[PDB]
Design a binder for this molecule. Structure first.
Ligand code: HEM
Length: 179
C-alpha cells in the first residue's frame, strides 16, 4: 500500500512541465522493493494528459499507457490509465480502481522529482519516487539531488536506469498525448 502524502513543489509551473515534451526516468526509489520508463506530459484540447512507456530490458515486457489527469491541487493529480499500443490503439480500457496519483515535488527546465502511487486491480502496490530528465540517461544535477535531500530521501538508495540497454520512441510518446 502507499504511505506518503508527497508535497508538491512550491510555485510549480504546470505549463512548463506539461509542455508536450518527453521526460526520461533516470533513477527511482521503490518504497516497497527493473524497468526503463519515460513519459510525455502535455495538454490536449484543454485536458492534462500523460503518455507512459515501460520496458523491461531483460524480459522484453513492454507497454504503453495514456491518461487524462484530474487536478487535486497544484502539482498533484489523479490519473485513470488506459493501456494502448504505441499507436494509441486501446488494449485495456479505463476502469474505476485502475489509476495512479502523480505529485511533482520538484521541477525545472531539465529535471524533476516526482512521487507516484499506483492502484491496479487487487494488487498491493507501494510508493515510487522518480528522478526525471529531459535527456535520456542524463546524470542527476545538483538541483534535483538537493530536492531529493530536501524531501528527506537518500539519493544513494535510488536505482539507476541509465546503464540498462533501453531505447525510447519519443515520437510515439508525444503523439500518444492526443489519444
Ligand atoms: C523506472 C521507474 C518505474 C518502474 C521500474 C516501474 C515498474 C512498473 C511495473 C513492474 C509495473 C507492472 C505492475 C504490475 O502489473 O504488476 C508497472 C505498471 C505501471 N506503472 Fe510503472 N514503473 C516505473 C515508473 C512509472 C511512472 C513514473 C509512472 C507514472 C507516471 C508509472 C505508472 C504505471 C502505470 C499506470 C502502470 C500500469 C499500466 C497498465 O497496466 O496499463 N510507472 N510499473
Amino acid at each position: 500500500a502507499c504511505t506518503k502524502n508527497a508535497i508538491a513543489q512550491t510555485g510549480f509551473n504546470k505549463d512548463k512541465y506539461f509542455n508536450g515534451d518527453v521526460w526520461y526516468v533516470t533513477d527511482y526509489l521503490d518504497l516497497e522493493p527493473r524497468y526503463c520508463a519515460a513519459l510525455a506530459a502535455g495538454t490536449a484540447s484543454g485536458k492534462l494528459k500523460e503518455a507512459l512507456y515501460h520496458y523491461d530490458p531483460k524480459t522484453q515486457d513492454t507497454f504503453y499507457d495514456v491518461s487524462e489527469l484530474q487536478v487535486e491541487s497544484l502539482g498533484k493529480y489523479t490519473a485513470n490509465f488506459k493501456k494502448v499500443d504505441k499507436n494509441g490503439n486501446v488494449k485495456v480500457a479505463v476502469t474505476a480502481g485502475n489509476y495512479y496519483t502523480f505529485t511533482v515535488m520538484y521541477a525545472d527546465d531539465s529535471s524533476a522529482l516526482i512521487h507516484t502511487c499506483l492502484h491496479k486491480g487487487n494488487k498491493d502496490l507501494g510508493d515510487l519516487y522518480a528522478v526525471l530528465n529531459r535527456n535520456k540517461d542524463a546524470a542527476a544535477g545538483d538541483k534535483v539531488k538537493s530536492a531529493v535531500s530536501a524531501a528527506t530521501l537518500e539519493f544513494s538508495k535510488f536505482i539507476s536506469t541509465k546503464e540498462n540497454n533501453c531505447a525510447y520512441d519519443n515520437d510515439s510518446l508525444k503523439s500518444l498525448l492526443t489519444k
